[PDB]
């Protein structure tokens, strides 16, 4: 049914991206460019940058979880939340500091979704707020790291969660 068709299906609007290999798919606005970051931080696969808004940056990290332990076994929302801070700080523990705002998890359709909320501090001021969500699918580790200016973060607060939650796996 959803075989689709080859044609000018792509229009000046929202685009759909899917990957059978990673088993994940999400929507994103047009005007965005994909940059290759092979050999980057472990798990890092591809990064998306919005030409329209240089300030706004999105990063995608894909990794495989050990069959012996799952997202739940790995750690709790709070535990994983703290681990993530150390992971990021490991390379940014010099001048910038990562603060964990909150961390919660939800269970729907038998699928567990982990939500991580944190912000980046510089010197004596907040640099920006970033939302990160973690979810496993068939042993595939999928993370959605979105970053946006604090000036409108409140206005588009749901936007970050929406994109991360909008994602689908298969």
Swiss-Prot record:
GO terms for biological process: photosynthesis. This is CyanoP. It is a lipid-anchor. PANTHER family: PSBP DOMAIN-CONTAINING PROTEIN 7, CHLOROPLASTIC, PTHR31407. Pfam families: PsbP. A lipid is attached at residue 6 (N-palmitoyl cysteine). GO terms for molecular function: calcium ion binding. Plays a role in the early stages of photosystem II (PSII) assembly; binds to D2 (psbD) and may facilitate its incorporation into PSII. Required for optimal photoautotrophic growth in the absence of Ca(2+) or Cl(-), functions in optimizing PSII water oxidation/O(2) evolving activity. Might be involved in assembly of the oxygen evolving complex. InterPro entries: Mog1/PsbP_a/b/a-sand, PsbP_C. Monomer. Present in about 3% of photosystem II (PSII) preparations. Purifies with partially assembled PSII complexes, in addition to a small amount of monomeric and dimeric PSII, and trimeric PSI. NCBIfam families: PSII_PsbP. GO terms for cellular component: extrinsic component of membrane; photosystem II oxygen evolving complex; plasma membrane-derived thylakoid membrane. Belongs to the PsbP family. CyanoP subfamily. A lipid is attached at residue 6 (S-diacylglycerol cysteine). Disruption phenotype: Wild-type growth in BG11 medium, 30 degrees Celsius 30 umol photons/m(2)/s; slightly reduced growth in Ca(2+) or Cl(-) deleted medium. Up to 40% decreased rates of O(2) evolution. Increased accumulation of unprocessed, partially processed and processed D1 protein (psbA); fragmentation of thylakoid membrane proteins PsbE, chlorophyll synthase ChlG, and membrane protein insertase YidC. Keywords: Lipoprotein, Membrane, Palmitate, Photosynthesis, Photosystem II, Signal, Thylakoid.
């Amino acid at each position: 049914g959803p075989l689709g068709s080859c044609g000018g299906v792509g229009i000046a609007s929202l685009q759909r991206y899917s990957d059978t290999k990673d088993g994940y798919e999400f929507l994103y606005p047009n005007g965005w460019i994909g940059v290759d970051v092979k050999g980057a931080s472990p798990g890092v696969d591809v990064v998306f940058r919005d030409l329209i808004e240089r300030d706004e940056n999105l990063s995608v990290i894909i990794s495989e979880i050990p069959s012996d332990k799952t997202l739940t076994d790995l750690g709790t929302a709070t535990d994983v939340g703290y681990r993530f801070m150390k992971t990021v700080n490991d390379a940014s523990q010099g001048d910038r500091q990562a603060e964990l705002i909150n961390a919660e998890a939800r269970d729907e359709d038998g699928q567990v979704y982990y939500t991580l909320e944190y912000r980046v501090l510089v010197g004596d001021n907040v640099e920006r707020h970033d939302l990160a969500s973690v979810t496993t699918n068939r042993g595939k580790l999928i993370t959605f790291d979105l970053s946006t200016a604090e000036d409108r973060w409140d206005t588009v607060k749901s936007l970050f969660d929406t994109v991360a939650s909008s994602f689908h796996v298969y």
